[PDB]
Symmetry: D2
Subunit: 143 residues, 4 copies
């Protein structure tokens, strides 16, 4: 069966910079997948369990952050990476979750929520609001 993850973005802090998506990737396991946009939300559709995709964001102050979401052994997972250099594109980071690329262990945690504060003080949270089944939903919150 196919899986989808639908993300809505909440930006809450008017002092730390405004974020926009600068890249969207899909990993090639499980027959791949695609991003789409509807009603102000972003949906990743995947061919089955065992793959993922990523949104990279950049702020008006030049801060670069990636959000990864996917399904591992039929359960959702997520991660956020901050403090990225300009050349650390999503194309670089998304593969790091597979083939013992350094971040596999995070995917294997199957997290339904994750939060981190960047070194320059930006907090990012991913929280699944629908955390079971094939039509998953999560909020991405910048603060």
């Amino acid at each position: 069966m196919s899986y989808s993850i639908t993300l809505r973005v909440y930006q809450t802090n008017r002092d730390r910079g405004y974020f926009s998506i600068v890249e969207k990737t899909v990993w090639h396991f499980a027959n791949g997948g695609t991003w789409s946009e509807a009603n102000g939300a972003h949906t990743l559709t995947m061919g089955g369990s065992g793959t993922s995709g990523m949104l990279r964001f950049m702020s008006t102050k030049g801060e670069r952050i990636t959000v990864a979401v996917g399904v591992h052994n039929y359960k959702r997972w997520c991660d956020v990476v901050t403090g990225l250099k300009p050349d650390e594109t999503a194309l670089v980071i998304n593969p790091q979750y597979y083939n013992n690329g350094g971040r596999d262990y995070v995917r294997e945690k199957q997290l339904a929520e994750y939060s981190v504060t960047s070194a320059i003080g930006t907090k990012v949270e991913v929280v699944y609001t629908v955390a079971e089944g094939n039509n998953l939903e999560a909020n991405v919150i910048f603060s």
Copy 2:
């Protein structure tokens, strides 16, 4: 510092028989300090940190046809390529690296083409044509027919 390059793409869809294409993935290669995609006035701009990198848009139609368009700058001149007939697992993340490190598509990048045309096995024609083909603020049309 290094000179930055931007490529701005506008999409023309002309043939209802091909179904309707939408973007399903946007990648940026990591050479030359990377880069970012942005959207404005219905156009898509890839901004890059220097000559020697690229990015890709993958499209999928309402009929399930998957096609990638790659654009970049090689030795200070624009390049482009179109790949059709893609399998569901042949994502832009798979294809974009193939232009580098002798990955199978370096040759077309090295041609520094200002236009590219191909017809897919199922009859969809795709053209990339640069309308501003020189300098640091490049512009091209992507045409489905």
Copy 3:
């Protein structure tokens, strides 16, 4: 309650000589409990609270040409119209009401057209063609050429 109607529009731009059109305004008329525009998969959907209302997209090209497309449902059947040659102050807010209350364009609404074609004075052709022309979930192509 009342039956709702939706109209989903996809835009095809085919001729680079016309410049490139983008949406500059989106309106909804207030009869039949109003309605809303939404965007998904690169298509534009007008959802309405009943038969007897409409909405409009106004487009402007990179060459400054302004054109409106109106779609709605009249007596349970779809309708459409295209107005070209618009002055800068002839916004969709001015034009959408003209289809009602004997405002000058009621006649075309009452025709319940499933297709419309016009060529502007400066040579831009615009077509609206419904591909799903019956029922409550209607679909049309808007074609610039």
Copy 4:
């Protein structure tokens, strides 16, 4: 001289519903104007001083709200109207600021900020971050 107003939307409350734009209008004085979208912001460009435009938003919980922005006698103005019925479209509300339509006095205040809490508890703020000149900028904040 032409005027522009660029708006960025901040949604901060994950419990009260997610908003999206459902209508965008431009008033016909001062040679009219146009909306555009870039970098996740919304820009209203106007032919001169003396006109305005509006964004209408609807939440996932069915709440309908309009935000009006414009320039009156060379100074920015704004307003927010909440508790709207489905048939109170932007096409209905935008004209109410002119021709003694009931809301002219709000436009004439030339506000650089405005906030209101709807009857069902949603707070909306418009705050100009660039409040002078021809290239104005404001945040629209839902909370």
